[PDB]
């Protein structure tokens, strides 16, 4: 089979408690993310797109094929941007990049929280490495991709589609954002500084 | 400045199709929030004396988003009711059968539109300028008024907050429940004269 496969979650579904619940991971990974994979496969089965990489589909396609391919990528990136036993202050190369751009971790936390809180409708917040070598924050809408929009190399992302938080926080996206800081996986950011993430 | 218009029914009256908890957040937090945010955005500005429709037609950005969502949600509550649903009645039945052939065909076509909308948005039954019914969608806070898609007759919210409490990812089950709530009397009122927000 040439079908795309959903990459494994990097942790069990209870490991992000109390910040993101079991029930949220069960639906967000088990229904939404799994759903994007199944839908993409349905759309490209028997077509010449069958042998494309996910990045090739993101860069080269539009419409439903784009939307599903990009969401598959974005969610895999999201799960890796979080973890159990993470959070807290940035360490290593990403700490230097954050200080160089924002002056301090606290300023970054303020700016990125405001960006995440401010996004209207469905979308994503990203910490990226720009071509000039400096860090920045950007947002995309719906399935929007920093790859397609050439916004920089993704380092971390936070999903602000309502399904990411509604089970646990209902309309209170700000409490979800505050909780997400307890989960952020700086090691993933540091790996992405070494080399761009390639989906597999 | 603007006040949130009262729900047309009690918050337990759409059970078992939409829960009390859903209405408490969707009306009490989201819809109320758009009113509060709009009021804070326009206070002390020349926009403070504009009608909701005027803000929808003449502004962009956050003022538009909040103004349009206020209108869209009020339209949504009126598009539903207790002891409604079922097959269409009155003049809207006629227009539906003329355009779509049968109610069953309409229900399939509009359900597919609602199910297929990617991201946050709205589905609408409208009256076009040629006097025929049609179905259209808008994205995020998009308004049929601003995009000149026809006169709104009914709408269904497919932002995830409209259904996540009750149906989680299963928007199709939410859509099927919405059909049990559809208020054909509101559609027929809107055929006689366009809805004016108050
Ligand atoms: Fe998501
Ligand atoms: Fe809504």
UniProtKB/TrEMBL annotation, chain B:
Catalysis performed (reactions): 2 superoxide + 2 H(+) = H2O2 + O2
Transmembrane region(s): none
Assigned keywords, A-Z: Iron, Metal-binding, Oxidoreductase
Domain Manganese/iron superoxide dismutase C-terminal: 88-190
EC number(s) on file: 1.15.1.1
InterPro entries membership: Mn/Fe_SOD, Mn/Fe_SOD_BS, Mn/Fe_SOD_C, Mn/Fe_SOD_N, Mn/Fe_SOD_N_sf, SOD_C_sf
Keyword DNA damage on entry: no
Domain Manganese/iron superoxide dismutase N-terminal, residue spans: 2-80
Keyword Iron: yes
Molecular function terms, GO-annotated: metal ion binding; superoxide dismutase activity
Binding residue positions for Mn(2+): 26, 73, 157, 161
Cellular component aspect of the GO annotation: cytoplasm
Positions contributing to Fe(3+) binding: 26, 73, 157, 161
Domain of life: Eukaryota
Family: Belongs to the iron/manganese superoxide dismutase family.
Assembly and oligomerization: Homodimer.
Physiological role: Destroys radicals which are normally produced within the cells and which are toxic to biological systems.
Protein name: Superoxide dismutase
Species name: Babesia bovis
């Amino acid at each position: 089979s040439m079908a795309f496969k959903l990459p494994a979650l990097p942790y069990g579904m209870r490991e992000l408690i109390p910040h993101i619940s079991e029930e949220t991971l069960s639906f967000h990974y088990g229904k939404h993310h799994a759903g994007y994979v199944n839908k993409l496969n349905s759309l490209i089965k028997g077509t010449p797109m069958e042998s494309c990489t996910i990045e090739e589909l993101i860069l080269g396609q539009t419409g439903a094929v784009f939307n599903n391919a990009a969401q598959i990528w974005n969610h895999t990136f999201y799960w890796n941007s979080m973890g159990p036993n993470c959070g807290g202050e940035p360490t290593g190369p990403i700490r230097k990049k954050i200080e160089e751009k924002f002056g301090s971790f606290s300023a970054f936390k303020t700016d990125f929280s405001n960006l995440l809180a401010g996004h209207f409708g469905s979308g994503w917040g990203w910490l990226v490495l720009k071509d000039d070598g400096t860090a920045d924050i950007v947002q995309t809408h719906d399935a929007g991709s920093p790859l397609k929009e050439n916004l920089g190399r993704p380092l971390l992302c936070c999903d602000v589609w309502e399904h990411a938080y509604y089970i646990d926080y209902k309309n209170d996206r700000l409490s979800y954002i505050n909780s997400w800081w307890n989960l952020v996986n700086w090691d993933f950011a540091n790996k992405n500084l070494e080399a761009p993430f390639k989906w597999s």
